[PDB]
Design a protein around this ligand. Structure first.
Ligand code: ZN
Lengths: 71, 64
RNA sequence: ACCCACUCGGCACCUUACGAGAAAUCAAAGUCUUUGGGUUCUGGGGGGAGUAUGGUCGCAAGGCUGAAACUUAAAGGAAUUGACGGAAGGGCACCACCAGGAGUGGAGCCUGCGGCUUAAUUUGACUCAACACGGGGAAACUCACCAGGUCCAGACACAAUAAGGAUUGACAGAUUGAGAGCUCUUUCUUGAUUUUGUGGGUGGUGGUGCAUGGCCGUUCUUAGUUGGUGGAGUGAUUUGUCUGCUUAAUUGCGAUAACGAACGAGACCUUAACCUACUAAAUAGUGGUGCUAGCAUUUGCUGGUUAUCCACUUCUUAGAGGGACUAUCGGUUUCAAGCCGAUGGAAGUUUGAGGCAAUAACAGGUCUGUGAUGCCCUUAGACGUUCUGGGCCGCACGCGCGCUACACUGACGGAGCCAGCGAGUCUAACCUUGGCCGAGAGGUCUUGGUAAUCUUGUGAAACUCCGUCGUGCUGGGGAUAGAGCAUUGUAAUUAUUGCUCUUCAACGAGGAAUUCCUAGUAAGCGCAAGUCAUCAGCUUGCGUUGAUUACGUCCCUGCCCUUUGUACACACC
């Protein structure tokens, strides 16, 4: 045939990171629980899922992409 | 046309460890039995065998 | 000298075969396992090799006598069937001539092939039997190519990761051709569906048609294949299956150690031809009557009225039948098969044209039709797949199929006006009459038709008729090209197609060569169908107009058939 070329630099993938995440759930000196990071209000995800915090950003994750409430 | 009327063709592809091979089967059914359709080849021309006569004999007549 | 009969001894042939042989053959090559007349000579698988060595002969060249080592499963004889010949005798054929026709070959463009060019210009096929072929008329798709971007649709097993999360997704931004969360920024999400690894799978228009199936093409516009009883031969085998004649035919007649058959040809099937004979029909049509228009008027002539009734089946349609069997007569030939001519007949060239079609062969073509397939290669930076854009159309040039033409049997413009094969819309927009609008192309408003019912009588074109032009590259011819309008489509630029104005090329009948064709055929003419969103200068069919010249032959060619040779048989590659 011919076989092989490339200007090199092979595309990686997606690491998806690790994290021991959902630490955000602050409970004080026994045993009161006030959550951290405000949650979404779309009836598909009944206020269990929360919102990411970037700049200008309160983003809904479970809503795979959708709905952009902001404050 | 007897082809259509009588013989039966079939092709079958049997495939084995070494390659494949084809089976071509032909069956000519007895035109005699036939049941429905022509009972004989267009070729066929049977002549019916007559009869030895005992002719001669002077006329005469018979009444009923 | 000749004739005739006979007899010795000769050079030979003929027919036979009791007999011999492996056979071809042989009056010896017979009288030979039923093995003995006398005698001289030679041979003991092939090659090594008539070589080496010695002896002898000769001027010489060389003659006679004459080993072994080693190697080798065969070499060889006669015959049989096949295959082949750059060997002989016959045939057949418009993919062969003749006698002619219409051409191609020259021109413009259309189109395939090569060549070149190219990021790529995907590829199979190269004499008949490759090159308007792959149904191959590519804007995307198709698509196999090139520049680039995603996705896994990697079943399954073991193992490893890990419920503190194995894994999925993504808003905006950066980025990308791209409103791809491909990637990264940031950080919500999801829950054991995935990930990594091994084995094992799979997809692939990747390779191999020189591994295969099937299919197709070719030999073949051919006439060949076989078996029963019998004859010949130890046999493989041969005769049947043949000199001639005769057919399109191993089609027949005839000759005859052959007789009577079977596949194939023929039969058969399909279509065009005939049917005032049968069955019929508002999805076909006719005659009459109603109803009604026009012109005549004297009755008439020419139309209208998807049912106003009644009748019919010539035309139309398709069911069952009939009909031709080269008939009747007569020429001609082995007075056989047949062939020729007249007559009759819807039709007498296998009635015209097709469908099928035995045995055998080719390394013909097809892994680019198949979820037909062996093997090999590839399988995640993919040769899988999908998305964007380009390309198969690229142009000094060679070749093949074509299309349009060089005009006056013509172009133009009026006007006359006639076919047959088709096809058309359900989970959809196909065939489209009709009414308006526009020079046109086309737009628009409705309509019939899933169809003998509607498009549609498909009012097609050559063609017919009356003009205009008047032989001048002319008003023949329409290439190239500029400008504007429309249609198909997500998209038309390298210009899909259609329209209008202008531009007005080559080509003044075409070298050597070469294709096709014998009657409603040739050629001229346009349709319909395939392909198809749009595109025919292509093809498959179809009807329209309708000639000339044979009715012969073996000269060119191509192929069959015997005879003959053969050391071929993997068969002259
Ligand atoms: Zn939400």
């Amino acid at each position: 045939k011919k076989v092989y070329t490339t200007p090199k630099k092979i595309k990686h993938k997606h690491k998806k990171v690790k994290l021991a995440v959902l630490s955000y759930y602050k409970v004080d000196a026994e045993g009161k629980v006030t959550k951290l990071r405000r949650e979404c209000s779309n009836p598909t995800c009944g206020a269990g899922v929360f919102l990411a915090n970037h700049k200008d950003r309160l983003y809904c994750g479970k809503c795979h992409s959708v709905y952009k409430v902001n404050a | 046309q007897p082809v259509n009327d009588f013989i039966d063709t079939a092709t079958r592809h049997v495939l084995m460890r070494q390659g494949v091979l084809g089976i071509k089967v032909k069956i000519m059914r007895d035109p005699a039995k036939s049941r429905t359709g022509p009972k004989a080849l267009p070729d066929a021309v049977t002549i019916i065998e007559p009869k030895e006569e005992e002719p001669i004999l002077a006329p005469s007549v018979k009444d009923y």
